[PDB]
Design a protein around this ligand. Structure first.
Ligand SMILES: NC(=O)c1ccc[n+]([C@@H]2O[C@H](COP(=O)([O-])OP(=O)(O)OC[C@H]3O[C@@H](n4cnc5c(N)ncnc54)[C@H](OP(=O)(O)O)[C@@H]3O)[C@@H](O)[C@H]2O)c1
Lengths: 498, 498, 498, 498
């Protein structure tokens, strides 16, 4: 029997585990230490959650090690590993409303969006990678023959072993799911560190692995701090790969920590300052809808959010007027209410950061067209914000806000290479977008953009089959698609002479 | 007009460039600094070689950056890039006797072996990767459709950009070629740091890039120290990928440096303590021939060399007797002499390490059956060495010798899992081998060995098409094969709505 | 409501549709023509089944064409097509005992075997191919650029369209499932002709597609004759691909019919005379167990059954002794008796062929060691049979029996190429096998065997992920594995200039 | 020494073999039978060429069989096979002017075009496929494990063996090269039947295989008739695959013949009636140039030639005007004259068909704007032709001309699905094209077009890396690209238990 925090909300009863998940059981942290998780809608404490200590990390890694080396997970057919992950996705679907509601409470996710994206895409992710298990294939290779003898050379794709996954707070279940589904499908075992501020869906997911019959120790979850828990995962001699999503500065530190311990493999999904280039020959009303979406989706807490919009001179003013018209129609409120389409920011410190970010924008000479402030109501709501007259040297032209802040610059009519240059003048390179009806411009622009994803006449169109990853200081390695598996597999070459 | 060090040897007139190669020209280092490269056959100075400074690294990177962004290399068809690399291989083949002679002088590589392997495989490498250029392909992906609209998702494989390659001294031209061929085939430009002690074939290769018509700046080569030149490559803000082959300790430092600068991509080919398991049911005389080769090939200066031989109890004594018989037949001598089987070690400091290594093996109680000493003659020759009665706790059971030292332990008749455990009890995992006529043993052992390559009834059978790389602290990423290309490519996802 | 033949049997009340399945409806054939399906355990009529006429084929093709061109199946996401095929597999699993009982009744499949193989593998097949739907990918190709312009070349994998599937009677549901799963996973629609003698699991399967929510017209099933129904499918101007499994002679006719109509695509899975080579260095008792299985599995009604065993001279006589001992232990009987090892042959005409086949083997000089005749009892049971002293020129050395008839020839101790020659001297090429503990023999023999599958130290080890298909007159194209999809997809090259 | 027909022409001395090429030597046919090859520029006899008989086919097939089974080609490394094919391409390049001149004489190919395309692309083809030799790889597959035991499943890609290649006369050397390069790269040997009317570049190519060191019997070439030589190839019991390019009706007969003999594999590249849809929003002047090329390239003797142009109402008249202006500037003349851009048709019988085709076009009511007639001069020249007012029911809207006849229909402004229906209302499906600046329209049209290739804002843009093949009655299988290899390879599955 598991201890839950119980809550009647959104026409259901939430049953939320709040403890560490180690070796298939929910347990207190060392010293029974706890911390509070905070509801961003009203600022209240949802509940106390166990605070993992170093010895808890070591227990989790040891359970993952044992599950990998001696447990059933390392012994079953790849097909049967697939079946378990497809069952896990089924169980998640059976609990979809509950997961989405927990995500609304914990992260401020608008419930209707959480159901479709945070949760819906997580379910798709497990089903997708479950199908990869018995389709992961090595090669046979026509090497030169040591005559008069013969040679056969094959490769075997094997699991990397014990993995550590460290994730951010913006889509807690979804980021967990993207990386965990690939990690498990490849036959690995894992210790997961959710962001300290958003532990709840991770711990509920942990319970769901029990319902799905995932063997004990295959999945371990440690709410706790990056500087303590995340650090120990990166340092651990028995961890063989870290999958990381978060800030560029933390990613640098993780990669360093991987190097200094045992050269564990690492993948990094880092920040973004993604440019969206909107040409005069686009469909304007549709550009407004998708442009707003590119920024405001999930209250801007989205690594691929367009952090910079370049709008062609002749449509700029009309674009801005229409955006302001639409912004005014947005319903800001409780993420659980059906009319809400803009929820609170994830946590208080992040709201403060956004208020300061916009002050700096104003101070440096950008035009604040609307928003810029906290919404005067309980919780941590921030106004959808539009800046114009943004110049390339400005702080807000360079820094990732990670909030609902549209940052608009003009470019001259007929210019193409000039705007590309400005769009590429960043050490980030996660995503980018272009709106145009012109086939030649679209294809040329997608070639020239220095970003791991280019959207054409859409934005935020991620898919579980489409690889997602950055260039330059946005990191390396892919989440999603077949390519994600390569971060969680090793290749063994076997060469016979006969 | 290029300055050469001319030398009449091996019935040839060598013409050896000795300067830095930057932007298609041979130039002195800053302040005309130089150092001596030493011939290991007699300890003499071959010539002075330019000693690259930080400002020279910056010039080479600048030249690589310009060549990639604006030069011809970034504009030609993939097919035509391939043509140029196939031409480069042809030029290398036209110069193969000269290259192999230079390698004999610089590295002590036995000339007949240098023709076939050091140079022969280098030529194969460029030809192989030249064939990949117009066969590197992305994907089109059946993503969910944003109804009532449609979506197309494709990926493009793009070059990573400016790369740094840092290599060791054991097969100077060949290690350069493995990495450089894959790097260029993927459309990158490069700055190469050969091992300071072995710059000569790299500088002659540089001249061959001119003869093949490789555009200026595509290939830059900087003889010099890792702590200065290599370090600056790892730190440089314009370098986007480092490809590294060398020790585990330098590998850690390189990876950390990649992290702290701009999270440039890194791949690591590190040390090895590769086990070879020889069962009583093997072909014994064959096991002797290949067992000796597994250790003594290229005077043991071979990252995948078997660093432990485990020999089944019932054949152990006969195996050792037969090895000693064959060892006595090996002809030690000048690498340029046709009857030479065993050349000198690469440089003096390494010879010193090997002497100390074997002193320690004797101190700790292993049976020295033969060799262990510097051969009494000029240069840095080391006697082929056999140790028996090696126990798992011993230093020589754990430490990589990187020399011609066969390190033998017994295992009990029938003890498969037990010998496997001992073979895997290392933080290395580069290679491994098994000799047995029994199909079931061979397949089971190859599954269980924790190494990037498993040889079965053979050893040292590498091939330009078969990926080569380690697990655990032997690093990550592959050289050779299609898999090598993945280190030198990035994936851009392009998603349309229409 | 659907009309059923109801039968209380095996603790179940079977509900068996008996009509044609066209456009989601069970309907009588033209003129309400019917035929009898016969129970092989007692020779009784199970029920009457609709007998499809030409106009019925045309209706089925029209329904498939409409389903493909305008129906939901052609509009849903690949992922959602995947979900439907998974759900179909789930429905089949929910009905597995019923399906296995129907197969026991209709084909004489031993119930315990039918559960695990006939039905169990069918379920695995749909689950496997369901996972491929959203992982079918095209390419982006680095073509030469039409300078000063640019080119993008991609491929799209598309369905072929309306398919016809014609299958035999040996594993009715399983052969249906192999082909249909790959067909549907690739996005096609289909008309299936089950063998006339075995229509019942196909018709129950049809009903399961309704329960699973497969759109109307996606699957159509027409019990009836090859010469009428199968012929019209091969001739039809709107059918674009035929997938065929059956005899070599009908395969020739089918391929010819494809040519003469509209050059529709064709894949052919035809006869076998598969050689099993058993060396003296094998595990003998295991060779007896697997050698028996290689012949007797599914009462020999198995296209890959070993049609000749070559047994090395020195073990031949002991091998035969052990086989005879084991053959005597086989329990022949009603497929529903849980201890039955050997069920009846599929239908009466096949039993008669087997009696004649054995009369001919004795006539031409082979030694009948055991079996060779009908078992005296109701139904169509044939004795597990062993022939020795079989020589290469003999009819039974050349002709496929498709029955439980072990056909043994000696080969000389220590010859390998000579036995390989004899094993390869056939125009069939579907499967083959080798038993040996010697790795060198096993690898060499597997290279040299001219057959689409080579088993090593096993037999009949098919897998839904492992491609299955013949060489020479055993046909071409694969069922199962990723390779199977290629028969059901077309490649569209799309080339832009911009 | 080889007998040549010598000819001084185009500032060269041509040396043309004229005999059968069998087992590495030029030999007379049975009975020394010969026939004349005709120069289409003036109708004169170029020379006499050996006329292969049935016994000659049997000799060629026996030579191919021996070369495959026992010769060097079956033994060498895939890498060394690649080297020979690369060397073959170099020899072709060394002879490119001579080959282009021979093709000018034999096929009427304009010399400048012959050099760039007929010959230039043939060289690219051999170099491209040479690169595939050591990159053709099978798989290792994670099948279910027969516990308590283990399984390993791998695939081996093997050659199909002896192949027959039968080709048309439109690009004699190029069609030879497309198929032969893929065939040889996959390790097969071959018997080639050039079109009887165009044997000369094939025979010269045969000589070049000798210069390149291709082992005897690997390439065999038999000038002769399809009804005799081609038929025997399709019938032969030792031929295992036919690669065919030609008419749909001969394709059907070839496939039938493959079926009736030994179910040899077959690929078919058949006719085309390829639609080109030109929207009003395209670049009109570029549409005229590329529209011109789509029809008139290689005097229309081009399987993928646009056989219908659909031009949007509002630009139709202006398009026709501009086309007529450009047609008038075409210089008709001797293919060896540098100012010629429209050469003669390939042979007299084809000229006759083109005359009859346009007579019928006029009879049935289409508007003949220009041409339609044999040019008054010696040889077989045909006036570039433009028809307008072409209606869907008309013979010339349905039947492939394979000549320089532009066939134009209107479609209403803003119609998309309507013109697609009309473009798709054909049993052909080889190529197609769309000109538009609208990205949404271009992508939608490319989805909907029922053809193996879709060109967007270009035409005739083939590439050796881009697969080329038809749908429906245009055949199946690809030439060019990775995909082409699959027609010349078989997959062997090898499954171990251990
Ligand atoms: N590229 C993508 O796929 C993607 C997706 C989502 C977010 N992001 C990026 O993430 C950033 C926003 O999240 P954030 O600012 O909260 O990121 P962050 O500070 O880098 O935190 C990410 C995770 O790393 C942990 N961490 C901190 N120090 C660590 C250490 N020394 N060792 C191991 N782990 C450590 C954090 O723990 P704590 O809980 O203690 O903070 C957290 O769980 C943005 O820049 C955004 O673009 C990127």
């Amino acid at each position: 029997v598991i201890n839950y925090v119980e809550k009647a909300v959104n026409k259901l009863t939430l049953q939320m585990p709040y403890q560490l998940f180690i070796g298939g059981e929910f347990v207190d942290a060392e010293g029974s230490k706890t911390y509070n998780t905070i509801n961003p809608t009203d600022g209240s404490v949802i509940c106390q959650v166990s605070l993992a200590q170093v010895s808890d990390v070591d227990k989790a890694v040891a359970a993952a090690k044992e599950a990998f080396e001696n447990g059933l997970w390392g012994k079953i057919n790849a097909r049967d590993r697939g079946r378990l992950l497809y069952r896990l996705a089924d169980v998640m679907e059976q609990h979809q409303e509950e997961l989405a509601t927990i995500e609304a409470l914990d992260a401020g996710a608008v419930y209707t969006l959480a159901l479709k994206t945070h949760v819906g895409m997580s379910i798709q992710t497990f089903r997708y990678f479950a199908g990869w298990c018995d389709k992961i294939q090595g090669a046979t290779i026509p090497i030169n023959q040591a005559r008069p003898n013969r040679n056969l050379t094959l490769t075997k794709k094997e699991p990397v072993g014990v993995c550590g996954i460290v994730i951010p707070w913006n889509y807690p279940l979804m980021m967990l799911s993207w990386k965990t589904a690939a990690c498990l499908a490849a036959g690995n075992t894992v210790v997961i560190k959710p962001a300290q501020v958003t532990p709840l869906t991770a711990l509920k997911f942990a319970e769901l692995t029990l319902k799905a019959g995932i063997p004990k120790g295959v999945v371990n979850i440690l709410p706790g701090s990056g500087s303590l828990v995340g650090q120990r995962l990166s340092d651990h001699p028995d961890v063989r790969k870290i999958g990381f999503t978060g800030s560029t500065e933390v990613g640098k530190h993780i990669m360093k920590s991987c190097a200094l311990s045992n050269v564990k493999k690492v993948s990094l999904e880092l920040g973004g300052k993604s440019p969206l280039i909107i040409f005069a020959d686009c469909d304007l009303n549709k550009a407004v809808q998708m442009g707003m979406s590119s920024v405001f989706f999930n209250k801007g807490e989205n690594a691929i959010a367009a952090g910079r919009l370049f709008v062609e001179e002749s449509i700029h003013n009309q674009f801005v007027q229409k955006v302001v018209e639409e912004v005014e129609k947005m319903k800001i409120g409780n993420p659980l209410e059906r009319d809400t389409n803009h929820g609170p920011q994830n946590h208080e410190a992040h709201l403060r950061k956004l208020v300061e970010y916009c002050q700096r924008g104003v101070k440096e000479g950008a035009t604040l067209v609307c928003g810029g402030n906290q919404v005067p109501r309980p919780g941590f709501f921030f106004q959808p914000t539009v800046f114009t007259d943004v110049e390339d040297h400005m702080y807000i032209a360079k820094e990732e806000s990670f909030g609902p802040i549209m940052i608009i610059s003009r470019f001259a009519d007929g210019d193409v290479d000039a705007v590309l240059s400005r769009a590429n003048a960043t050490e980030f390179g996660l995503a980018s977008g272009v709106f145009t009806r012109d086939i030649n411009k679209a294809l040329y622009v997608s070639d020239k953009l220095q970003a791991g994803t280019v959207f054409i006449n859409t934005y935020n169109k991620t898919d579980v089959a489409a690889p997602f990853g950055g260039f330059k200081q946005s990191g390396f390695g892919k989440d999603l698609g077949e390519a994600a598996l390569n971060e969680y597999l090793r290749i063994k070459t076997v060469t016979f002479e006969y």
